[PDB]
């Protein structure tokens, strides 16, 4: 049973490849463009089940990560900006519900 929807898991990330609708053949997801809510709605209405997104696990920045590699700043619901201490935010977010 679907516990987490694909739309809830690809929201805010960055589409790695130009993804076309297999039926009607339009460019739904653009390479290097953040998946907004409109893209989520388009994908949920299209026959797409796996989306290849850029993740911190696979960014080649020399020091740290960078904005496209990461995705969306969940505190502001916009693209993450340069200088964000995303590591401390990640650690605090994981550790807060530990209690």
């Amino acid at each position: 049973e679907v516990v987490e929807t694909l739309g809830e898991r690809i929201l805010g990330r960055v589409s790695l490849h130009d993804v076309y609708n297999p039926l009607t053949e339009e460019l739904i997801l653009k390479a290097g463009q953040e998946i907004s809510e409109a893209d989520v709605k388009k994908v949920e209405a299209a026959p797409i089940e796996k989306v290849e997104v850029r993740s911190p696990l696979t960014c080649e920045a020399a020091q740290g990560i960078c904005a496209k590699c990461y995705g969306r700043n969940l505190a502001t619901n916009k693209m993450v900006q340069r200088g964000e201490a995303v590591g401390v935010v990640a650690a605090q977010s994981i550790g807060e519900p530990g209690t």
């Binding site: 898991r9 993740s55 960014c59 990461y70 590591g87 990640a90 994981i94």
Partner: protein, 49 residues
């Protein structure tokens, strides 16, 4: 990522996968040497990639 997220999901805690991905990336920045070769590195040495 999935195994750590399952523990939080079993109690209704919503955390984005980006945080766990950042931590796991920090968990895999080193490699284990097995052939010394002609470099200054030595055997059984955990070195940054």
């Amino acid at each position: 990522v999935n195994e750590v997220q399952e523990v939080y999901r079993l109690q209704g805690v919503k955390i984005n996968d980006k945080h766990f991905e950042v931590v796991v990336r920090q968990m895999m920045r080193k490699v284990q040497i097995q052939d010394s070769g002609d470099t200054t590195f030595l055997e059984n040495q955990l070195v940054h990639k």
